[PDB]
Design a protein around this ligand. Structure first.
Ligand code: ATP
Lengths: 408, 427
């Protein structure tokens, strides 16, 4: 869905809606400066901080930071809460996160399936200008291209070694059909993260891992075999270490012991771009008795580079909800989207996005091809936003204000 | 079993390469000169009857004994018994002195010789289908295999369809399937979809060489000992490798692994095991404990033909408190076999043999030299005179001649003297 950063190459002035990104020009222009600061070597071992109101495309801006660095640089999302797990030490939880960010570039010989598609757990048939063949769909392969939104007639390249499907284009509404036989083994660059090499070489996770058993805690013995092989590949010239970008969300939740590890991992010359994201104005530090602005220690605030996102305008919100409406395959009347964006004004964007999927089912029961205002007004009255739900409980708990207008 | 190659002691049978078998007509009567034999009609015909008794399966716990002096066609007739039994049959010639080992027991050495006398005739014809998998669903299954130098699609029988569903399959798996009731699968194995990141994986298999469709022809003729000596290694050098006193490579547990796989090949009907002939020279040298092993061996149906030979008339039983018996064989085992007597050759018969051996060895000689060497075949043993052919040919080549004369053979007796004459000369 997200194409890139959506900024000008020379002037670095961002477009209102470009490269899968909508609005937030101030933050995206500041994001473009940070990328240039690292490239010139001006900023060395410095974290980024995307502060702002909730649901202001904070993940998307950092997703833009990734694609604008290199062709295949690793980007990983980590919520600060996910670190505090019942089984897996918060050290291993953070080590996995950093290893998910650092990748290695190796040129490998692997077969790539290239050709036009003729669509139907299932069976999807492929075609070339010379040969035709039927292929039974794998359970994980179905979930892989549905996220890519692959339709019949599309020209695609499926690398069998990685499993990634890449949309090269289309023959009819354009790129023409490939000549030879589908599977062709070529010298292609493979970028696999350190954590992925660990999970490949370590014991395969059995079906229903959350049902019972230990988490993805990679053994120190296995990780050693990978680290020593990567170090041997660096010297040989076989592998090229590429530092990606780690995105940390809910940063206020991080303990003082986490920040000491983050700086220890940031100390390395091949450290990734650590992007922090705080949705809070004023928050206390965890582990430390003292309070701070975004929940960062007195030492981190001076090192970090802060960027601020702003609240979306009704016109900025207009397309965001329509893009999400098309992605969820729903058809709305112009009045309904205007109402849905009006919800996004006082209540959150995320709450308004939830009302999209709920209104579709009520419209399905009415048997209509257009989701209208009365269909949206229902979802708002059936399902409450956090601020309204708490208001509902508070009044039911104790009647704070009487009929007379007297308090208590 | 295909890699297993037969190693045979050719030095023992080297003195009998001139013999092709047993010379006899349809009725059973022996010819005057046939299959490289001269005289010995009575003994030739006698064992020419025992070969039929084996073929008719009437040798129920029975053996053969060759009674006669040194160089009376004993070892020669034993080889003829094998040659007449069938094609590529095991013949194991031993001497009682060989049993007398330093490390292994008297029967741990007699055991391997029995294993050297029981062979296996293999006649397996398999239709190989090696390569990857490219599944198609017809009305009972179409699979396209990809090999290192070829590509072929085939419409499989419904019998294979039931066998493939039992052992999980997916597109891009290296498989080994057979038309002759064979099913073998390698799930997810393919070197084509292998990343350089994982090394300790070993879950992938390389693309099979050559073509998908291969006609494998297996015609193997090896003894039971060949299976043991080939499975002992953890193999070309092994034909000259034996420098170890203990010889602990062959263990009872290793033989059990051979016995079970051999049984599996019989049950399938692929290869049947064929018992041959075990020849024991110096039969009197055998211990009483060895004869009781033989008594137990002869009772088994899998057992080969135990042919013994004794140059002694009355001899004390080895392993018993000085008990004189006929040929040194105990009564218990003497009754168990039938005796065939081997007659000594007269001077006229000896020179007929010389001409046969010289023709095979490639030694040209004058008529007068054959007479002089035959005189040594009657005064001394038949083996000694036959040994004079090789040095006399060198003495002739040195003199520039190809034809060996009396003067050349006269020096051979002067240079290479027999064990009897060499002893008396020292005084
Ligand atoms: N009847 C025969 N015709 C042709 N060759 C013979 C005949 N009899 C014996 N010989 C040959 O005499 C040579 C030496 O004798 P050999 O060692 O075979 O004695 P044997 O009687 O067979 O056994 P043993 O060693 O027990 O005496 C061999 O080459 C053998 O083939």
């Amino acid at each position: 869905h997200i194409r890139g950063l959506g900024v000008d190459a020379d002037t670095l002035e961002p477009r209102p809606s470009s490269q899968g990104l909508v609005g937030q020009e101030k933050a995206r222009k500041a994001a473009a400066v940070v990328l240039e600061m690292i490239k010139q070597g001006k900023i060395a071992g410095r974290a980024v901080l995307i502060a702002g109101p909730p649901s202001t495309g904070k993940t998307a801006i950092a997703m833009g930071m990734a694609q604008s660095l290199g062709q295949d640089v690793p980007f990983t999302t980590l919520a600060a809460s996910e670190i505090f797990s019942l089984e897996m030490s918060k050290t291993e939880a953070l080590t996995q996160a950093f290893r998910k960010s650092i990748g290695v570039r190796i040129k490998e010989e692997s077969e790539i399936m290239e050709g036009e598609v003729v669509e139907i757990q299932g069976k999807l048939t492929i075609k070339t200008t010379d040969m035709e063949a039927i292929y039974d769909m794998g359970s994980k392969m179905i979930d892989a291209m549905t996220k890519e939104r692959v339709m019949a007639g599309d020209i695609i390249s499926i690398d069998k070694s990685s499993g990634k499907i890449t949309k090269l284009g289309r023959s009819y509404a354009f790129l023409q059909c490939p000549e030879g036989e589908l599977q062709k083994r070529k010298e292609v660059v493979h970028t696999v993260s350190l954590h992925e090499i660990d999970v490949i070489n370590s014991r395969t996770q059995g079906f229903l891992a959350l049902f019972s058993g230990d988490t993805g805690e990679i053994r120190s013995e296995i990780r050693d075999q990978i680290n020593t092989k990567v170090a041997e590949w660096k010297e040989e010239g076989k592998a090229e270490i590429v530092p990606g970008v780690l995105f940390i969300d809910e940063v206020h939740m991080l303990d003082i012991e986490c920040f000491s590890y983050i700086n220890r991992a940031l100390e390395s010359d091949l450290a990734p771009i650590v992007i922090m994201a705080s949705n809070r104005g004023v928050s206390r530090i965890r582990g430390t008795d003292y309070k701070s602005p975004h929940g960062l220690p007195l030492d981190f605030l001076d090192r970090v580079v802060i960027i601020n996102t702003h609240p979306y305008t009704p016109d900025e919100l207009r397309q965001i909800l329509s893009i999400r409406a098309q992605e969820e395959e729903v058809d709305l009347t112009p009045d309904a989207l205007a109402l849905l964006t009006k919800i996004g004004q006082e209540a959150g964007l995320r709450y308004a996005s939830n009302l999209i999927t709920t209104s579709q089912l009520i419209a399905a029961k009415r048997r209509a091809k257009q989701v209208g205002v009365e269909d949206v007004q229902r979802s708002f009255k059936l399902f409450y936003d956090p601020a309204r739900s708490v208001r509902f409980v508070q009044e039911s708990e104790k009647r704070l204000i009487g009929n007379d207008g007297v308090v208590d | 079993i295909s890699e297993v190659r037969g190693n045979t002691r050719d030095h023992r049978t080297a003195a009998h390469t001139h013999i092709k078998g047993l010379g006899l007509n349809s009725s059973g009567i022996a010819e005057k000169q046939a299959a490289g034999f001269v005289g010995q009609c009575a003994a030739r015909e006698a064992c020419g009857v025992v070969v039929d008794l084996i073929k008719a399966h009437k040798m129920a716990g029975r053996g053969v004994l060759l009674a006669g002096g040194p160089g009376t066609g004993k070892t020669a007739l034993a080889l003829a018994i094998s040659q007449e039994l069938g094609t590529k049959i095991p013949f194991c010639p031993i001497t009682g002195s060989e049993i007398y080992s330093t490390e292994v027991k008297k029967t741990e050495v007699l055991m391997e010789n029995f294993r050297r006398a029981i062979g296996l005739r293999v006649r397996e014809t398999k239709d190989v289908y090696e390569g990857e998998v490219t599944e198609m669903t017809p009305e009972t299954l179409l699979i396209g295999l990809k090999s290192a130098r070829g590509q072929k699609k085939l419409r499989l029988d419904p019998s294979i369809y039931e066998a493939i569903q039992k052992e999980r399959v997916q597109v891009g798996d290296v498989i080994y399937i057979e038309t002759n009731t064979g099913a073998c699968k390698r799930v997810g194995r393919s070197d084509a979809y292998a990343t350089e990141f994982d090394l300790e994986a070993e879950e992938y298999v390389p693309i099979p060489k050559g073509e998908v469709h291969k006609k494998k022809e297996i015609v193997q003729d090896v003894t039971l000992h060949d299976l043991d000596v080939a499975n002992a290694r953890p193999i070309i050098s092994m034909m000259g490798q034996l420098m170890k006193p203990k010889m602990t490579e062959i263990t009872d547990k290793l033989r059990m692994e051979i016995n079970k796989v051999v049984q599996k090949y019989i049950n399938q009907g692929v290869a049947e095991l064929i018992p041959g002939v075990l020849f024991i020279d110096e039969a009197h040298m055998l211990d009483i404990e060895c004869f009781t092993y033989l008594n137990k061996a002869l009772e088994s149906p899998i057992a080969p033909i135990v042919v013994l030979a004794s140059n002694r008339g009355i001899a004390t039983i080895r392993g018993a408190d000085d008990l004189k018996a006929a040929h040194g064989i105990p009564p218990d085992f003497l009754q168990r076999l039938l005796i065939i007597p081997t007659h000594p050759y007269e001077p006229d018969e000896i020179r007929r043999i010389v001409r046969i051996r010289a023709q095979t060895e490639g030694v040209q000689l004058t008529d007068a030299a054959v007479d002089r060497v035959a005189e040594h075949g009657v005064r001394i043993s038949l083996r000694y005179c036959l040994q004079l052919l090789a040095p006399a040919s060198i003495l002739a080549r040195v003199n520039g001649r190809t034809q060996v004369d009396v003067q050349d053979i006269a020096e051979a007796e002067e240079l290479f003297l027999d064990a009897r004459r060499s002893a008396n000369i020292l005084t």
